[PDB]
Amino acid sequence: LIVTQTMKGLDIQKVAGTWYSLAMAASDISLLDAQSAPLRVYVEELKPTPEGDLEILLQKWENGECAQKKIIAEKTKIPAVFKIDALNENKVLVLDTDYKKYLLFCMENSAEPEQSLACQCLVRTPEVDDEALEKFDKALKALPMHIRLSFNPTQLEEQCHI
Ligand SMILES: [Cl-]
Numbered sequence: 001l002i003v004t005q006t007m008k009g010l011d012i013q014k015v016a017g018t019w020y021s022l023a024m025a026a027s028d029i030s031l032l033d034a035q036s037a038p039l040r041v042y043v044e045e046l047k048p049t050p051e052g053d054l055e056i057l058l059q060k061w062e063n064g065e066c067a068q069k070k071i072i073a074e075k076t077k078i079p080a081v082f083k084i085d086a087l088n089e090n091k092v093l094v095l096d097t098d099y100k101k102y103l104l105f106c107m108e109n110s111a112e113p114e115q116s117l118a119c120q121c122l123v124r125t126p127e128v129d130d131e132a133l134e135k136f137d138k139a140l141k142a143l144p145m146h147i148r149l150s151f152n153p154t155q156l157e158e159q160c161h162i
Contacts, residue, residue, distance in 0.1 A: 002113035003106050005095045005139055007080040012048045014099045019043045020156045021058075022128070023121035023136055025145040031118055032147045035061035035160060039107070039118040040149075042161055044068070051075075054082050054092075059160050066160035095139050100124065102132035104139055114144055126156040 021042045026032045031039040040061065047055035054073035059066055073082035073092050082092040088111045097103035106119035121136035123129050133150070155161045 001081075001091070001093070002108055002117060002143070003093050003095065003119075004142060006078070007094045007096060010080045010094055010097070011099070012052065012054060012075075012079065015046050015094075015097055015103060016048050017124075018045045019103065019122040019124065020126055021120050021151075021161075022123045022156065023133055023148070023150050024118060025120075025136075025140055025143075025148045026116075026118040027114060027144045027146060028116060029147045031116060032149055039116075041069070042159075043120070043122055061160050095119075096135060097122075102129060102135065104136055117143065119143065119145070126153045128153060 024032055026039055031037055042059040043056060044059055045057040047057065049055065052075040056071045056073060058069055058071065060069050061067070071084055073084050076083050080094045084090045084092055084107070088109055090107050090109050093106045095104040095106065101124055103122040104119065105122065106117055108117035119140060121132055123132050151161050
């Protein structure tokens with residue numbers, strides 16, 4: 001937990017459904033450069049199981065394909081942290097989400113937080129919400145982010161964002 005901010009009272013059942021990864025920032029340029037970057041992933045939908053786990057359907061550039069992956073985020077004791085498995089075990093921290101418009105989340109790594117941590121600004125619609133990106137930038141002023149990608153509405157609608 002290098003990330004100091006976290007959602008209190010998260011109703012994971014309420015973040016269910018579809019999302020666009022409007023912004024992404026990483027603590028390392030190398031995590032977000034080419035589309036093949038290891039953290040250049042595009043959320044599509046968030047499926048919370050009844051048991052409380054969180055399915056994430058994301059797009060991701062695999063080879064020359066915009067490949068669609070599905071990652072399962074297991075619940076933890078903290079309602080706002082989830083545990084994707086398991087090259088190393090990565091936490092998925094939810095920082096802020098009004099459920100209806102935006103959702104700020106970060107994945108870090110337990111074994112190396114500062115050298116690999118990506119955060120993202122999800123939004124419900126394919127618009128450019130400045131109130132959302134501002135909150136995103138507020139949350140990141142305190143983090144060691146070295147790359148900051150931002151997409152345009154027409155990019156949001158294509159797969160893997162172009
Ligand atoms: Cl147009």
